[PDB]
Design a binder for these strands. Structure first.
Lengths: 82, 91, 200, 108, 97, 200, 200, 200, 97, 108, 82, 96
DNA sequence: GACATGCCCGGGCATGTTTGCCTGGAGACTAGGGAGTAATCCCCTTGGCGGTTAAAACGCGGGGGACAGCGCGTACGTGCGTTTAAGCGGTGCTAGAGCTGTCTACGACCAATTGAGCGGCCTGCAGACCGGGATTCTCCAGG
DNA sequence: CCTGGAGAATCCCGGTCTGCAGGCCGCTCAATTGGTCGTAGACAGCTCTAGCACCGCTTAAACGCACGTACGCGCTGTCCCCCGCGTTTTAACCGCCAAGGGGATTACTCCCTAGTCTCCAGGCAAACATGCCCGGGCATGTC
C-alpha cells in the first residue's frame, strides 16, 4: 500500500539537517548515502518498538514503545515520557 | 501515573521566583528525574549484589553517586545527601 | 388605638337562664340578615337591622339593662379597640345618637346610651331590659353594624365576637352570651356556601 | 498519637521521601531498603534538579523570556561541562544545537 | 544585478537552523516512511500521533550528529565538501556498521 | 461583643408554680407561628405574632413582672450577646416602643419596658403580670422576634433559647422557664422537617 | 376636600419634544410593574418601583425639573384632590423624604421635593432633569404610589392620571405628559386581563 | 445611602482598540475564578484574585489610568451606591489600603487609588496603566470582590456590572468596557449550572 | 579448619556441549574462563531485559514470553530465529514430560 | 518417595534448570518466576554456547590443534558477523587480533 | 615514593602496539600523544576500581574490581572472572 | 652489504604481532605506572597479580583498537604516517 | 348571577455547610541481616643474584610529507513554475483503557536423595631446540 | 626502465626431548527434586470511551527544475626532512629463589534495623438545610 516514501526526504530536507550540523558544502552523492543511513536507523528503532507492542498484545504503537526502543540503543529521549 | 511536576515547580520558585515553566519543559524534567533515579537505584542495586548484601543503605547510594556523577557534581550531591540523612536521623 | 384591658367573654347563663335566639331568614341574593345555628355566626349587611332574641327562664328584676360590645376573636388583636375603619369614621352617617366611631348601634330605642369608657377606651351600647310582650317568650333587640368585616384599618377581615351581657342597675353581671358576626355584602350567598361545606 | 510530619519536610527537602521509599522498594532494585536511603537519594535528585533549573533560568534571562522552554534546558546542559557528561547521550525535544561553526569554514 | 558569492548564503543558513528548533523533515512524508517500513514486519499496525513525533525527533537528532562528525572528517582531509567517504568513515570509527 | 456571664436557664417554677404553655397550630408550609411539644421549640416568622401562655397555681402579688431574654443554645456561643444583625439594626422598623437593636418585642401591651443591662450587655423586655379569666387557666403574652436565625452577623444560623422569668417589683427571681426558638421563612415546613428528623 | 380648579392634562411637548416611554415587562401574576401601550395605562404594586422614561428632541438647559401630579380620569371626580385614603394616611410608612398624605413618591433620587399647593390644594413631587448618554434616547425616573386604586375613601376604584410636567428652574411650564395608572396587588394579571378585556 | 448621579456604561474601544481579556479557567469545585465568554460574565469567590487582562492595538500615551466601578445592572438600583453589606462592612478584613466599605479591591499594586467621591458617593479603584512585560501581549490587573452577590443589605442577589474605563491623566475617556460578575461560594458549580442552562 | 568455600561455574556444561560438536577436541582452562564470562554475560542481558518487560507491562511474573521477547531484542536476526526454536522445544517438551 | 528425575533431563538439555531458576528468582529481576521461564532460558544459553564452541573447534583444526585456547575463541567470534555484533564490546584475554592489512599499505 | 614511570612505556613498546593496529609508519609526535591517552584511560579505570574497593572496605584491588570498573565504561573483559 | 627498503621490515612486524597474543608492553614498568596513578586517589593500596594483568589486557586492547581507527584516519587523509591529530579525531568521533 | 380583587398554601429553585472515601504517616512486634570478635593462613610485598634480552644510541639515505601551480568540473545561487504539505474542518469506529470474576498458577514449606564441587594423581599435548630446505626479497646484467 | 638469475636472509618443516595442564576418579555436603498446601496475580469477558483513521476543500509555503558562473578538488612536479633500517652499546627486565606478615577470609555470637500489620489525619466530592419567588384556588366586594 506504501512505496517509495523514502524519496519523501527531499534534498532540502537533507541540506537543513546537514546545515544544523555545521556543514557548509555538500556533494551530490551525500543524498543517496544519507537516505541509506536514515532507513537503517529508523528501521532498527521501528523493529524494537513493534517488538514491545507485540509483547503488550496491542495493535497500536505508543510513544513509550518508541522511547524504550531508542533508550536501549543509548538514545535516552526526554519529552515523550520516561 | 505519579509525576514530579509539583516539586519541579517549587524548586524553581526557590531559585527564580519570577520565572515560569512550559508544559514541555516540565515533561523533560520528569524524564530527567526518572532517568537519574534509575541509574542511582540501578548501580546501588549492583553494589549490594557484588558485596553479597541485601539491604540498600545510604552508603550504596553515596558510592553510586560518585560512579555516576562527575567529580564536581558528586561532591556537592554527597554534601546535600549527607545533611538530609544527618538531619533526618537527628530529628 | 390600644386598650389597657380586654373585656370578658365567658358564657354565663345566670340564675335566670339567659340565652340568645335568632330568626329563620332565608339565603337569597337579596337578604339583609340571616343567622346560622351550626356556626353560631350571624350574616348581615352594613347598617342593616339585626334582630336578636333574649330568652330567660325567669323575669329579671326591674332596672336590668342589656349591653353590647365587640372584640376581635383572635387574642393578639383583643387589646385593639374594635372601631369603625378610618374611612367609615370620617363619613357623615351619624343618626344623631351614635358617635361617629362606634361600631354597634341599637335602633328604635330612645333610651340608648353609648359609652366610651375613660379607663378602657372601649365602645359599648346599653339599653334597658324589658320582659317579653304578650305572645312572645323572649325579648328582641335590633342592632346595627356600621363596618364590613373586610374594612381595612378597622376589622381588616378579622372575625369579631358580639358580647351580649345582662346587667343590673349598678352594672353588675347577671348573664352573658356571645356569637360570631360577619358584616359582609350579599349574606345569603355566604350562608348558603358556608352551609354547603357544613354538610360535606 | 502525636501529629504527623511529612518525611520530606522532616528532612528539609522538597521532593517526596515517601514516594522514593516506595519506588526504591519496588521495581526489584533490592530485597530491603534502609530508612536513610530514600532521604539521601531525594536530596541528590533535588540538587541536580536545582542546578538545571538555575542554569536554565539564566539562559531564559539571556533571551529576555519570562518562562523556561525546552531550548533553555538544552543550553544549560551543554554549556555546563559536568552536565554535558551526565547527560551526554540524551536527546531533548526541540532542543536544537549550539551555534558552533568551525573556524576553517569562516570567510577571509 | 546582484548575486551573493557562494558560501555566504550557506553561512547564514548554518546560523539560522542552528538557532531554531523546529523540525526539518516534513511531517507527513516521514509518517508515510515510518509505515512503509513497519508494514514489512506487521500489517494493520496503528501509530499514535505522539509515537510518530518521537521517531522523527530521534532520527533528526541522529542525522545531525552524523553530519557534525562527517564535517570534521572532511576538515581532517583539508576538504570543505563532505563526501560519502566522510560519512562511512565516521560511522566506521564509532562501530555503527 | 461578648458578655461577662451566661444567664441561668434552669427551670424554676417557684412558690406560684410558674409554667409556660403554647397553642396547637397546624404545620402549613408558611404558617406564621407554630410550636412543637416534642422539641419544646417554637417556629415563627420575622416580626410576626408569637403567643406564649403563663400558667400559675396561685396569683402572684401585684407588681410582678415577666421578663424575656435570649441566649445561644450552643455552649460555644453562650457568651455572645444575642442582638439584631447589622442589617436589621439599620432598617427603620421601630414600633415606637422598642429600641432598634432589640431582638424580642411585645405587641398589644401598652405598659412594656425594654432593658439594656450595663454589666452583662444582655437585652430584655419586661411587662407586668395579669391574672387569667374566671374560667381560664393561663395568661397569654405575644412576643415578636425581629431577626431570622440565619441573619449573618447576628444569630448567624445558630439556635437560641428564650428565657422567661417571673420577677417581683425589684427584679428578684420568682420563676424561670425557657424554650428554643427558630425565626425562619417557612415555620410549618421547618417544624415538619425537624420533627420528621426527630422520628429517627 | 374639593379643589378650586382642575389641572390641565393636555399633552404639551414644548420646545424640547418632551415625551414619555415605558418598558416591556411581561404579565406574570405578581410582576412588580408593567405598562400597556394599547391602554396607555400603568400596572404596578403599592410602594413598588414605577419606571418612567423621558424622551426629548433636544437637551433642556440645566436646572430643568420634572413634576408629577395625580388627578381622577373621570370628569365627575376631577375636582376631588387625589390623596391617600384615611387608612394609609394614618399608617407609619414615610421614607423620611415624602409627607404622609402624598400619593406619589420618587425613590433613588436624593434631590426630590414634595409640595402641597396652598390654593388648589393639590399634591406634587419634583425632581431635576438629567440627560441620557449620547447612545441612549431617554432618561428613566422611578416613582412610587402609596395606595391601591381600590382604597375606599381615597381613589375608591376610580382611575387616575399621573400628569408629568417639565419645568424650568423658576417653575414655568416647558412640557407636559400624562398616563393612566392602576395600583393593584396583581399588576401582570390585571394588565393581561384588561388587555384581554380590550379584545373581549 | 444614595448617589446623586449614575455612571456611564457605554461601550467604546477607542483609537487604541481597548478590549478586556480573561483567563481560560475550568469549572471544578476548587475553582476560585472563571470567566464565561458565552455570557460575558465572570464567576469568582469572595476576596479571591480575579485577573483581568487589558488588550490594546497600540500603546496609549503615558499617564493613562484604568478605573473599575461597579453598578447595579437594574436601573432602579443604579443610584444606590454598590457597597458591601452592613455585616461585611463591620468585620475586620481590611488590607490597610482598601477602605472597609469598598466592594472591589486591587491587590499587588502600591499605586492603587480608592476613590470615595465626595460629589457622587461612588466607590471605585484606579491604577496607572503599564504596557505588557517583556514576552506578553497584554497587561494584567488583579481585582478582588469582598461581598457575595447574595449579601443581604448590600447587593442582595442583584446583578452588577464591572465598568472598566481607560482614561488619561485628566480623567478624559479613552476607552470603556464592561462585563457582568457573580460573586458566589461555588464559581465552578454555578458556571456549570448557568452554562448548562444556556445549552438547553 | 575448612579448606575452601563452595563455588559454581558452567565449566561442566561448556565441556559437555563441546564434545557434542567436536567429540575429539579439548579446551584449556583459559578458554574455559572466557566461556564462563560469556554465559554470565548473556544471562544478565536476557534476565535484565525480561525484568523490564514485566515492569513496563506491570506484570510481576517472568514467563517464557518475556524471555522470548528479550531474546528477540538482544540477539541478531539469524541467531534469534534458532534461539527461539530451541527455547520453544524445551518448554514444549518440558510441559509434555 | 519416587525415583527423582532432573528437570534438565525432562527438557533434554545439558545446562542446569535448577541453577537458572535460582538466578532468576534472585538478582532482583522480578517478584515471581514462571515454571517455563528457566527451561526456555537454559535452552537459549545452551544454543549460543554450541555456536561458539563449534566455530572454535574448526578454528583449532585449522591451526592443527586438538585443544581450544582463547586465541581460537577470538578468531571464531569475529569470523561470524552475527556473533561479532553480539560481542562487539567484549575483550578476550590473550585473544589477539585478526591479520588484516590495508591494501593501500601493501607494496608494488 | 615513585615518579616518572609513564616514561617506562618505552618507544619500541608503542611501536608494537601500533603494529597490531595495522600501522605501517609512525611519526615521532605519536609517542608523547599516546602516553597522554594511556594515562587518561588508566586514571578513569583505576579511580572506579578503587571506588569499589573502598566501598567493600578492602585494601587490595582484586580482579573483580577492575572488571566492574571496565564494564560500566562500555568495555567488558572476559577471562578474569565476572 | 645487504639491507631492505624502508617499509619492508615494518610491514613484516605487522604480520608477526597480529598473529601473536602475548603482551607487547613490559610488565614491571607497567606495574609502577599503575601504582603511581593509584596512589593519587588513595595511599597504601595493594594489588593482586591478576588485577594488574586485567589492566594490561584492557589498556592494550584499547590502544590497539585506537590505532586501528587512527590508521584509517591517516589513510583517509591520503597519508601513510599516523599523526597526533589522527588520534585526536578518532577519539573525538568516539565521544572521548 | 357574573365579575373583580387580594391573601394563603404549595412547589421548586437558589445557596452554603456537613458527611463520606482515599492516601500518607504513626505505633508496635518479630525475625533476620548486619556488625564485631577471634582465628587461620593464603597471597602480596620485598630483597638477592645472575643471565640476557630488550632498550637506548648513533648513523645513513631513501620514501613520504609537504608546498606550489594549473585545469575544469561540480557545486552553489537565483528565477520561475509546479506540487502537495498544513490547516481546519467533518465523520466513523476501532482499539485502548478500566472494571469485575474466577481460576490456574507459583510461592512456601518439609522431607528425601542425587548432582556438583573440591582434592588428589598420571599421560598426552604443547612447547622448546636444532638442522634442513623451501620460499621470499633484493641487486646486478641483458635488451 | 623492465625482466631474469643468483645470493642472502627469513620462515617453515621434521625429529627429539621435557614439563605443566587437562582430564579423570573418589568422597562429602548442600542443593535439587517430590509432594503436599495456600493465596492471588493473571486470564477472561465485559463495557465505555478516547484517539486514530479516513475524507474533503482551500491556501501557499515548500519543493522541482533549469541556467550561469566560480570556487573548489584533483593531479602534477619538486623540494627536503623526517622516519626507517642497521650495528653498536648500555640498561633494566626475567627468571628462580627465599622469607615475613599483613590482609582476606571463615566461624561464632549478639544487637539493632526493616518488614509486616493496624489505625488516624488531611484533601476532595455529594447530599442536606433553608430562604426566596411564582402560580393556583378560594374568599369576598362590586355590578
Amino acid at each position: 500500500v506504501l512505496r517509495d516514501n523514502i524519496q519523501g526526504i527531499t534534498k532540502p530536507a537533507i541540506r537543513r539537517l546537514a546545515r544544523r550540523g555545521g556543514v557548509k558544502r555538500i556533494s551530490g552523492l551525500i543524498y543517496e548515502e544519507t537516505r541509506g543511513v536514515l532507513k537503517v536507523f529508523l528501521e532498527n528503532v521501528i523493529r524494537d518498538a513493534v517488538t514491545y507492542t507485540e509483547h503488550a498484545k496491542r495493535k497500536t504503537v505508543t510513544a513509550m514503545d518508541v522511547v524504550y526502543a531508542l533508550k536501549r540503543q543509548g538514545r535516552t529521549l526526554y519529552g515523550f515520557g520516561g | 501515573k505519579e509525576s514530579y511536576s509539583i516539586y519541579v515547580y517549587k524548586v524553581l520558585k526557590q531559585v527564580h521566583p519570577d520565572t515560569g515553566i512550559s508544559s514541555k519543559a516540565m515533561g523533560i524534567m520528569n524524564s530527567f528525574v526518572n532517568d537519574i533515579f534509575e541509574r542511582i537505584a540501578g548501580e546501588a542495586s549492583r553494589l549490594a549484589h557484588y558485596n553479597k548484601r541485601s539491604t540498600i543503605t545510604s552508603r550504596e547510594i553515596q558510592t553510586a553517586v560518585r560512579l555516576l556523577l562527575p567529580g564536581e557534581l558528586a561532591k556537592h550531591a554527597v554534601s546535600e545527601g549527607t545533611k538530609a540523612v544527618t538531619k533526618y536521623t537527628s530529628a | 388605638p390600644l386598650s389597657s384591658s380586654v373585656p370578658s367573654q365567658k358564657t354565663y347563663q345566670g340564675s335566670y337562664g339567659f340565652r340568645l335566639g335568632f330568626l329563620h331568614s332565608g339565603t337569597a341574593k337579596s337578604v339583609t340578615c340571616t343567622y346560622s345555628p351550626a356556626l353560631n355566626k350571624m350574616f348581615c349587611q352594613l347598617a342593616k337591622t339585626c334582630p336578636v332574641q333574649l330568652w330567660v327562664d325567669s323575669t329579671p328584676p326591674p332596672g336590668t339593662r342589656v349591653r353590647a360590645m365587640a372584640i376581635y376573636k383572635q387574642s393578639q388583636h383583643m387589646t385593639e379597640v374594635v372601631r369603625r375603619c378610618p374611612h367609615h369614621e370620617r363619613c357623615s352617617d351619624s343618626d344623631g345618637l351614635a358617635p361617629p366611631q362606634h361600631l354597634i348601634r341599637v335602633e328604635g330605642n330612645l333610651r340608648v346610651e353609648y359609652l366610651d369608657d375613660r379607663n378602657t377606651f372601649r365602645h359599648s351600647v346599653v339599653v334597658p331590659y324589658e320582659p317579653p310582650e304578650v305572645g312572645s317568650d323572649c325579648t328582641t333587640i335590633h342592632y346595627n353594624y356600621m363596618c364590613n368585616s373586610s374594612c381595612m384599618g378597622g376589622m381588616n377581615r378579622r372575625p369579631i365576637l358580639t358580647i351580649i351581657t345582662l346587667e343590673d342597675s349598678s352594672g353588675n353581671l347577671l348573664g352573658r352570651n356571645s356569637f360570631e358576626v360577619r358584616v359582609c355584602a350579599c349574606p345569603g350567598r355566604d350562608r348558603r356556601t358556608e352551609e354547603e361545606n357544613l354538610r360535606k | 498519637r502525636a501529629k504527623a510530619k511529612t518525611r520530606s519536610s522532616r528532612a528539609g527537602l522538597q521532593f517526596p521521601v515517601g514516594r522514593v521509599h516506595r519506588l526504591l522498594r519496588k521495581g526489584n532494585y533490592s530485597e530491603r531498603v534502609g530508612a536513610g536511603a530514600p532521604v539521601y537519594l531525594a536530596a541528590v535528585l533535588e540538587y541536580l534538579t536545582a542546578e538545571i533549573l538555575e542554569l536554565a533560568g539564566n539562559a531564559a534571562r539571556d533571551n529576555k523570556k519570562t518562562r523556561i522552554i525546552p531550548r533553555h534546558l538544552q543550553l544549560a546542559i551543554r554549556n555546563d561541562e559536568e552536565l554535558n557528561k551526565l547527560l551526554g547521550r540524551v536527546t531533548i525535544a526541540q532542543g536544537g544545537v549550539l551555534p558552533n561553526i568551525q573556524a576553517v569554514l569562516l570567510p577571509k | 544585478p546582484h548575486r551573493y558569492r557562494p558560501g555566504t548564503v550557506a553561512l547564514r543558513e548554518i546560523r539560522r537552523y542552528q538557532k531554531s528548533t523546529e523540525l526539518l523533515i516534513r511531517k507527513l512524508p516521514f509518517q508515510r516512511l515510518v509505515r512503509e517500513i513497519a508494514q514489512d514486519f506487521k500489517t494493520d499496525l496503528r501509530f499514535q500521533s505522539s509515537a510518530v513525533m518521537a521517531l522523527q525527533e530521534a532520527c533528526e537528532a541522529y542525522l545531525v550528529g552524523l553530519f557534525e562528525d562527517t564535517n570534521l572528517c572532511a576538515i581532517h582531509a583539508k576538504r570543505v565538501t563532505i563526501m560519502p567517504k566522510d560519512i562511512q568513515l565516521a560511522r566506521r570509527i564509532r562501530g555503527e556498521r
